[PDB]
């Protein structure tokens, strides 16, 4: 093996540690030339066996424990994407692979170091939600969680209000911050 030190592969944040009960954001680069076929996203069993467990796929099939609390959301379309995982369980600590069944198969790896602490957005619905004013420079949003496709639906859409909230006055739902191009953390309501 010879490892070229002048590589076209861009930098990927090796670790994206986050608050227990909160959420993360994993931007996985892929070959711009060839667009995606199946954005497989995996785990590790061990350092030797390490059979990765496709948590999610482009179809939308999700695993048992991440059923609901996990998503992959293509955009930032220009040759990468953003897989999210809200509701900060500890056990989730490990390494995640951004598989694709294109050609140049970089299997970029990212380490998720989970640390217990204050959650940046509020609790569980029925519909509380909260993100710090410093984190609020963006646009706290809500999505109705679908393993096929995340679709935004109405909630409290105002300034910081206790800060966020969720209302569905008349399932699994998400209440998260969005940068626009990219995306910030999540929120899990029922």
């Amino acid at each position: 093996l010879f490892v070229n030190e002048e590589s076209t592969i861009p930098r990927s944040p090796t670790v994206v540690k986050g608050v227990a009960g909160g959420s993360v954001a994993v931007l996985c680069p892929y070959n711009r030339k060839e667009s995606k076929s199946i954005k497989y996203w995996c785990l590790w069993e061990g350092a030797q066996n390490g059979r990765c467990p496709l948590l999610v796929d482009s179809e939308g099939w999700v695993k048992a424990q991440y059923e609901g609390r996990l998503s992959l959301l293509e955009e930032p379309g220009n040759g990468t994407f953003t897989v999210i995982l809200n509701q900060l369980t500890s056990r989730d600590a490990g390494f995640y692979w951004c598989l694709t069944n294109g050609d140049t198969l970089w299997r970029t790896t990212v380490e998720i170091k989970i640390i217990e602490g204050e959650p940046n957005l509020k609790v569980p619905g029925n519909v509380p939600c909260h993100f710090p004013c410093k984190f609020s420079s963006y646009e706290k949003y809500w999505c109705k969680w679908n393993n096929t496709g995340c679709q935004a639906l109405p909630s409290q859409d105002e300034g910081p209000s206790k800060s966020r909230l969720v209302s569905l006055t008349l399932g699994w739902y998400w209440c998260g911050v969005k940068q626009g191009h990219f995306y910030g953390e999540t929120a899990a309501v029922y």
Binding site: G117, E118, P132, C133, K134, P160, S163
Partner: protein
């Protein structure tokens, strides 16, 4: 019984990522469940102090109006009052949280100084010094992290901030981290981090290792070619 006003500094709030407002009230009388709370001028009087030292042996029996509250208040961070509701205290009182202009706010300048050659020659230990000048309004948590791993607080010792004689408003501080000489000789980076309110990202990692100090040898090569000109 006593009353005092103190605002949480940026060093504490950065460590907490929130604010724990406190109105110092100790030396209380033997009254169970003291109903003393830090009262905001906006009406958001904090909760009664949770898990207060109900029966600690100290005769003071401290019951401070401190409580855990949100960070948004100090994201605003205006002047805050204090009203104390205690049976033995009949005098009404309000104290406004002196941090108003808070002197000023200057950007601290961090300098990392490697060990002196003499103590390395002594062969026992080396002391890297992290010195912060300016320091407009006190406020600074200094952490020592090596290879991205925060080192033990025992190894590095900081200092109580003292003023500057070049400007009374200015404040400087120092923090020495000691290691074995072999660790520094090896080449480990040990770079110290500074956290100030003035801080643009609210943190710094100034830099140093053995092979980034003053050089002892210089072989500059100046190759001259008439058919160079396209720098590989």
């Amino acid at each position: 019984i006593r009353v005092f006003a103190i605002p949480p500094s940026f060093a504490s709030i950065f460590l907490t990522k929130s604010t724990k407002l406190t109105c110092l009230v100790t030396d209380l009388t033997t009254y169970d469940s003291v109903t003393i709370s830090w009262t905001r001028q906006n009406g958001e009087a904090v909760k009664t102090h949770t898990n207060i030292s109900e029966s600690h042996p100290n005769a003071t029996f401290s019951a401070v109006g401190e409580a855990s509250i949100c960070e948004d208040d100090w994201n605003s961070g205006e002047r805050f009052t204090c009203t104390v509701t205690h049976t033995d205290l009949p005098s009404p009182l309000k104290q406004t949280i002196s941090r108003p202009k808070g002197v000023a706010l200057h950007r601290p300048d961090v300098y990392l100084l490697p060990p002196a050659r003499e103590q390395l020659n002594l062969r026992e230990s080396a002391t890297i010094t992290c010195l912060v000048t300016g320091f407009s309004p006190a406020d600074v948590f200094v952490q020592w992290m090596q290879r991205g791993q925060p080192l033990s607080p025992e190894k590095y010792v900081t200092s109580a901030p003292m003023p500057e004689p070049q400007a009374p408003g200015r404040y400087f501080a120092h923090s020495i981290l000691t290691v074995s000489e072999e660790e520094w000789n090896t080449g480990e980076t040990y770079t110290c981090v500074v956290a100030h309110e003035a801080l643009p990202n609210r943190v710094t990692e100034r830099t140093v290792d053995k092979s980034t100090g003053k050089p002892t040898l210089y072989n500059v090569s100046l190759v001259m070619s008439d058919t160079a000109g396209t720098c590989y």
